[PDB]
């Protein structure tokens, strides 16, 4: 087509979605991790994670307001990834990289899994 | 902080939100324009438009599944703007610029209003 494009649009949209998350506006699901609860928007979770995409496209699960993750999932690793989903920023540190990579593999967040693999390989 | 950032994350999120819109997945509102209906996600509309932000933060309207726009609003202008919300791409043409600007002013989409004003000024 002959469209024009606003460079900062996608970033501004994500920033506003994160402001709605902060203020608990229109959040429609609770993600339960080892008895730690995280409120979010199903559409943002689906847009970021192959696991959430599969969960909320399921005809029965699409209607659930609570999702319980596998007990092996670390709440801090999940929190870091949820922040990444809403900001594009990943708080990757020596002390959390293993939990973050394991959580990203479970959530099916391929780009996160990729940078974790590379950061681990650099330290070996 | 000491975060790393994935450059394409915001764009990939918006692309996936538009794929959900295309497939009518988790859309939670119908926008009615001069008897033309558009299905969308409330959170994306709020992230893009000051009008939708005000509508869906209202304690009564946040729960509506149908929103009727002012009868002066042109369905094509709305359609072009809804596409812009989900893609960052604006199909601005000599034949639609007046309807698009009028719709962007009503929806409170300041960056769109700005490029319409500039494109109109260049043709005078």
């Amino acid at each position: 087509d002959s469209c024009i494009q606003f460079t900062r649009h996608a970033s501004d949209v994500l920033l506003n979605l994160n402001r709605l998350r902060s203020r608990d506006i229109l959040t429609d699901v609770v993600i339960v991790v080892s008895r730690e609860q995280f409120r979010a928007h199903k559409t943002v979770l689906m847009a970021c994670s192959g696991l959430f995409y599969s969960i909320f496209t399921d005809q029965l699960k699409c209607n659930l307001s609570v999702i319980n993750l596998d007990p092996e999932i670390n709440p801090e690793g999940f929190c870091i990834l949820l922040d990444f989903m809403y900001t594009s920023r990943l708080n990757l540190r020596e002390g959390n990289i293993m939990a973050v990579m394991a959580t990203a593999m479970y959530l099916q967040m391929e780009h996160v899994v990729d940078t974790c693999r590379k950061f681990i390989k650099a330290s070996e | 902080d000491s975060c790393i950032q994935f450059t394409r994350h915001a764009s990939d999120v918006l692309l996936n939100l538009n794929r959900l819109r295309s497939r009518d997945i988790l859309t939670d509102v119908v926008i009615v324009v001069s008897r033309e209906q558009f299905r969308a996600h409330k959170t994306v509309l709020m992230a893009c438009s000051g009008l939708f932000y005000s509508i869906f933060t209202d304690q009564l309207k946040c729960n509506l599944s149908v929103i009727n726009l002012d009868p002066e609003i042109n369905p094509e202008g709305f359609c072009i703007l809804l596409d812009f919300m989900y893609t960052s791409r604006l199909n601005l043409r000599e034949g639609n610029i007046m309807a698009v600007m009028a719709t962007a002013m009503y929806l409170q989409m300041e960056h769109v209003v700005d490029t319409c004003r500039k494109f109109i000024k260049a043709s005078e």
Binding site: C3, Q5, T7 | -
Partner: peptide, 4 residues
């Protein structure tokens, strides 16, 4: 705004 840009030409994509």
């Amino acid at each position: 705004w840009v030409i994509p």
